[PDB]
Design an enzyme around this catalytic site. Structure first.
Site, short mmCIF file in Angstrom:
data_model
loop_
_atom_site.label_atom_id
_atom_site.label_comp_id
_atom_site.label_asym_id
_atom_site.label_seq_id
_atom_site.Cartn_x
_atom_site.Cartn_y
_atom_site.Cartn_z
N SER A 5 -1.30 -6.16 -2.30
CA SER A 5 -0.05 -5.47 -2.59
C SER A 5 1.11 -6.43 -2.35
O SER A 5 1.13 -7.50 -2.99
CB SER A 5 -0.04 -4.16 -1.81
OG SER A 5 0.93 -3.27 -2.31
N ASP B 180 -2.46 0.31 -11.83
CA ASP B 180 -2.22 0.24 -10.40
C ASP B 180 -1.27 1.35 -9.97
O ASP B 180 -0.24 1.60 -10.61
CB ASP B 180 -1.62 -1.13 -10.08
CG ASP B 180 -1.33 -1.32 -8.63
OD1 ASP B 180 -2.26 -1.67 -7.88
OD2 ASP B 180 -0.16 -1.10 -8.23
N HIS C 200 -5.36 1.21 -5.93
CA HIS C 200 -4.43 0.25 -5.34
C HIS C 200 -5.08 -0.53 -4.20
O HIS C 200 -5.66 0.05 -3.28
CB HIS C 200 -3.16 0.99 -4.86
CG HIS C 200 -2.11 0.08 -4.30
ND1 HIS C 200 -1.50 -0.89 -5.06
CD2 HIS C 200 -1.55 0.01 -3.07
CE1 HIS C 200 -0.62 -1.54 -4.32
NE2 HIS C 200 -0.63 -1.01 -3.11
O1 LIG Z 1 3.13 -3.08 -0.93
C1 LIG Z 1 3.57 -2.86 -2.25
N1 LIG Z 1 3.24 -1.82 -3.00
N2 LIG Z 1 3.86 -1.97 -4.21
C2 LIG Z 1 4.55 -3.10 -4.17
C3 LIG Z 1 5.39 -3.68 -5.31
C4 LIG Z 1 5.55 -2.97 -6.50
C5 LIG Z 1 6.31 -3.53 -7.54
C6 LIG Z 1 6.90 -4.79 -7.38
CL1 LIG Z 1 7.86 -5.48 -8.72
C7 LIG Z 1 6.73 -5.49 -6.19
C8 LIG Z 1 7.34 -6.88 -5.96
F1 LIG Z 1 6.66 -7.52 -6.96
F2 LIG Z 1 8.48 -7.61 -6.06
F3 LIG Z 1 7.40 -6.78 -4.59
C9 LIG Z 1 5.97 -4.93 -5.16
O2 LIG Z 1 4.37 -3.66 -2.96
#
Ligand SMILES: O=c1[nH]nc(-c2ccc(Cl)c(C(F)(F)F)c2)o1
Ligand SMILES: *[C@@H]1O[C@H](CO)[C@@H](O)[C@H](O)[C@H]1NC(C)=O
Length: 348
Positions: free
Chosen positions: A147, A246, A292
């Site tokens: 994640s 996801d 996830h």
């Molecule tokens: O622990 C978690 N769950 N979901 C995320 C998450 C979801 C979308 C995006 Cl764009 C990002 C990022 F890429 F910049 F951080 C992180 O992080």
């Protein structure tokens, strides 16, 4: 078995959000020159108000004060071959996520800053302290994460490689395993990650890989948090694990699960877009499931794409880094268009 032991960083200026020392959990394997450094995930926070809320009810993710002395290694961090066919004999490191900055931050708590965002410096300090604990003898350092930790792999793997080169260890092969951190800056179905990351980078003094930074330039570094944009700029080998549907992606897209036509097409298009971004990623595992994270779950061995499990694909990747290999594939992306069209998807 509670087999990974906590070590708080000896350099206590490298801190979690609240200024408590960061750290790592370690389970050494004297017979092994393989090192697995795993980055925990857990979203992020990007202003005083939402970080204060996270401090109230997600405090282990902003502070080490309440961390336990040990953790059990699970999935890819398990030392039992039955649970971890891939690297059960490796030196295991779990790096808790206590910087709320997707592992990008390089800012201390100060007169100006209520919180420290030191994710990028935590990784570098863990690496440098581990060199004295056996990492100096390593042949492979696999930086893995799930994640936000998976995105953290993409943001930091080349910096770890450069750090080890500059410290005089050019024989250590640094590689990345990014699980569930490959996101799309797509239209929502109905705050939004691109804006929150833009604000976060400022709030955190966030840093991104140099080549990606040079492409997108000042004010556009948020682009480097998106795997399909930062991956082509990286020089270290990176294996990408990503569910095609996801749950975190769907959450940021404002999708909450009969599905009618509009949402059906939205979901199918998301899967096809994800698949497209992985077409030129030679080491990847992308099952058509709504789920996830995968790699530290005890039953991570169960999912298969085209008949090949992730532990097998990772082993095949190891072999490829010694022409494709007979019956031992590394690029495994489902082509069926709907969640759970793969029968091996997690059941929930
Ligand atoms: O622990 C978690 N769950 N979901 C995320 C998450 C979801 C979308 C995006 Cl764009 C990002 C990022 F890429 F910049 F951080 C992180 O992080
Ligand atoms: C402690 O970490 C900080 C931040 O990375 C660094 O500037 C400093 O040199 C380190 N101190 C020691 C004694 O290693």
């Amino acid at each position: 078995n509670e087999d990974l032991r906590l070590h708080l960083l000896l350099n206590t200026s490298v801190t979690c959000n609240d200024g408590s020392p960061a750290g790592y959990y370690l389970k050494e394997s004297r017979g092994s020159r393989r090192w697995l450094l795993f980055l925990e995930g857990g979203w992020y926070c990007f202003n005083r108000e939402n970080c204060d809320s996270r401090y109230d009810t997600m405090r282990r993710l902003m502070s080490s004060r309440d961390w336990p002395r040990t953790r059990t290694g699970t999935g890819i961090l398990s030392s039992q071959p039955e649970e971890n066919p891939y690297w059960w004999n490796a030196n295991m490191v779990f790096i808790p996520y206590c910087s709320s900055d997707v592992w990008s931050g390089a800012s201390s708590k100060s007169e100006k800053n209520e919180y420290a965002f030191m994710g990028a410096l935590i990784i570098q300090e863990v690496v440098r302290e581990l060199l004295g604990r056996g990492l100096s003898g390593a042949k492979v350092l696999l930086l893995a994460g799930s994640s936000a930790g998976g995105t953290g792999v993409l943001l930091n793997v080349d910096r770890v490689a450069e750090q080890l080169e500059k410290l005089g260890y050019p024989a250590i092969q640094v590689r990345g395993l990014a699980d569930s951190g490959w996101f799309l800056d797509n239209k929502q179905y109905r705050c939004a990650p691109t804006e929150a990351i833009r604000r976060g980078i400022r709030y955190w003094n966030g840093v991104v890989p140099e080549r990606c930074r040079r492409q997108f330039q000042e004010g556009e570094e948020w682009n480097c948090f998106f795997g399909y944009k930062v991956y082509p700029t990286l020089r270290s080998p990176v294996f990408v694990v990503q569910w095609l549907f996801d749950e975190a992606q769907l959450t940021v897209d404002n999708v909450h699960l009969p599905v009618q036509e509009g949402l059906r097409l939205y979901i199918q298009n998301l899967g096809r877009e994800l698949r497209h971004t992985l077409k030129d990623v030679p080491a990847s595992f992308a099952p058509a499931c709504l789920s996830h994270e995968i790699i530290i779950r005890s039953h991570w061995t169960d999912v298969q794409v085209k008949g090949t499990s992730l532990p097998r694909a990772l082993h095949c990747w190891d072999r490829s880094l010694h022409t494709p290999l007979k019956g031992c594939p590394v690029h495994l992306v489902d082509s069926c268009p709907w969640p759970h069209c793969n029968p091996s998807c997690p059941t929930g």
